[PDB]
Amino acid sequence: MRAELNQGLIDFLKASPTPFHATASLARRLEAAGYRRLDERDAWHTETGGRYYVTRNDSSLIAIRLGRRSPLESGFRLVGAHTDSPCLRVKPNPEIARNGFLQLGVEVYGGALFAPWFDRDLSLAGRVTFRANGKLESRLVDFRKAIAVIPNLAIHLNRAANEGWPINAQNELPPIIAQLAPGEAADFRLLLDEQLLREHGITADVVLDYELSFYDTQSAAVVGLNDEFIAGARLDNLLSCHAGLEALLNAEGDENCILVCTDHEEVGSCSHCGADGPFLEQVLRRLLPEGDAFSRAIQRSLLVSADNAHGVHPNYADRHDANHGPALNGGPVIKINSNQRYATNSETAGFFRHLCQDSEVPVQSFVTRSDMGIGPITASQVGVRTVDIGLPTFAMHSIRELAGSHDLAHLVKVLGAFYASSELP
């Protein structure tokens, strides 16, 4: 059922307010399915038929199904996605006290659209690092309830509001979380300490640092007269993580299947744990002999880089090429850009397109208007052929994005077919 898949997506989104939580949610499903967690510090002893996963920074995840045939001779079938989404992150000395409020200073992470973050019931989640019994450790928190808001200024006090103004992030985006009594101090670290106790039963000696993201408490939901759509934060790109996961868990065949979901894509993938890092490469090498084996394996592999595409928006149709306007619910989009903003080529495109035909999934094509500006990055790190595809969406980088409610099922089906395909060379 599309309906079961879509509900599964809504659940996953709800459990995944930050890249740490997305990674943990992926890990829980994998383990329930029998996948064994490996640690990058240990020597591994994997084998044919094994089901494994590994993480790095608790925010990037690689899932591995080793097939019957070795990667050396049959290659890997890889699906790539990303765990991060543009949002607001709490600063390290964040307490702002003004006009009787307590606010938290925020950085903008990734290319967020600012306006939609206003007038939303926000909570806060992510990683907290602390010392307990002279031991340094980390946990995830999620306050869950709506503790914050970034309100708009009344139109009465900003009469040209609808003219547009340059929203200044330093000044306009700090959320209000509380009011302070006369002479009441404010200690955010103390609030985190309370949350650690409440959520984990832990008392910290001291809260040191954290990576906390504001997020919307409004769950994702089906929308539309005929339930055509799905609305929710983080569709870019938890939509693809979830699809890629369902495809891996249900895939037939006995190929070598990889699900790589990396952090830091919204920011250029350049970290210890991003796609422009050697995470993927160092995991794959561990599944092969030394020498030429990795190079040979990779030239028999294909990466399907799954990241949301732009549907043609009816109130802004002129932002698309008239020949390449994807329809929501018209299936996955093959993304082409010969300037290598996407890595797709005629062979990767052709293979995917054929795969969609054999699976009876509709398929679409996108290029940008020629007067407008992980695929290329991972191709360039490990050298693997890549097709960039995505489900068509609107309002990418909003706090609440829109996709087609038929498209997840289309994508799970074709990814399932990819992962089961014994042929690529």
User: Which of 216, 236, 388, 407 is in the footprint of Zn ion by CB under 5 A?
Assistant: 236
Q: How far is the CB of 82 from Zn ion (least distance, A)?
A: 6
Q: Is 276 in the site for Zn ion (CB under 5 A)?
A: no
Q: How far is the CB of 118 from a second copy (least distance, A)?
A: 6
The entry of Zn ion, a second copy, none near residue 377 (CB within 5 to 8 angstroms by kind) is: a second copy
Which is closer to Zn ion, CB of 127 or CB of 335?
Answer: 335
- Angle at the Cα of 335 (from 410 to 373), degrees rounded to 5? 140
Which is closer to a second copy, CB of 172 or CB of 254?
Answer: 172
Q: Indicate the residue type of 71.
A: P
Who contacts 236 (Cβ-Cβ below 8 Å, separation ≥6)?
85, 307, 308, 393, 396, 397, 401
Q: Is 237 in the site for Zn ion (CB under 5 A)?
A: yes
State which of positions 298-357 bind Zn ion (CB under 5 A). 307
Q: How far is the CB of 357 from a second copy (least distance, A)?
A: 8
Binding residues: 82, 156, 397
User: Rounded to an integer, what distance in angstroms lies between the CA atom of residue 39 and that of residue 290?
Assistant: 20
Which is closer to a second copy, CB of 312 or CB of 411?
Answer: 312
The entry of a second copy, Zn ion, none near residue 307 (CB within 5 to 8 angstroms by kind) is: Zn ion
The entry of a second copy, Zn ion, none near residue 237 (CB within 5 to 8 angstroms by kind) is: Zn ion
Q: How far is the CB of 25 from a second copy (least distance, A)?
A: 19
- Provide the CA 320 distance to its chain's centre, in angstroms: 24
User: Rounded to an integer, what distance in angstroms lies between the CA atom of residue 147 and that of residue 317?
Assistant: 38
The entry of a second copy, Zn ion, none near residue 420 (CB within 5 to 8 angstroms by kind) is: none
Which is closer to a second copy, CB of 167 or CB of 185?
Answer: 167
The entry of a second copy, Zn ion, none near residue 33 (CB within 5 to 8 angstroms by kind) is: none
Q: Is 398 in the site for Zn ion (CB under 5 A)?
A: no
The entry of Zn ion, a second copy, none near residue 93 (CB within 5 to 8 angstroms by kind) is: a second copy
Contact 282, 44 (CB under 8 A): no
Q: How far is the CB of 311 from Zn ion (least distance, A)?
A: 14
The entry of Zn ion, a second copy, none near residue 34 (CB within 5 to 8 angstroms by kind) is: none
Q: How far is the CB of 107 from a second copy (least distance, A)?
A: 5
Phi (first) and psi of residue 230, to 5 degrees = -125, 130
Binding residues for Zn(2+): 82, 156, 397
Q: Is 378 in the site for Zn ion (CB under 5 A)?
A: no
Q: How far is the CB of 109 from Zn ion (least distance, A)?
A: 11
Cα dihedral 182, 183, 189, 190 sign? negative
Which is closer to a second copy, CB of 216 or CB of 246?
Answer: 216
- Segment lying near Zn ion (by CB under 5 A), choices 18-26, 38-46, 237-245, 271-279: 237-245
Per-residue contact string for residues 243-272; x = within reach of Zn ion by CB under 5 A? -----------------------x------
Site for Zn ion, rule CB under 5 A:
236-237, 266, 307
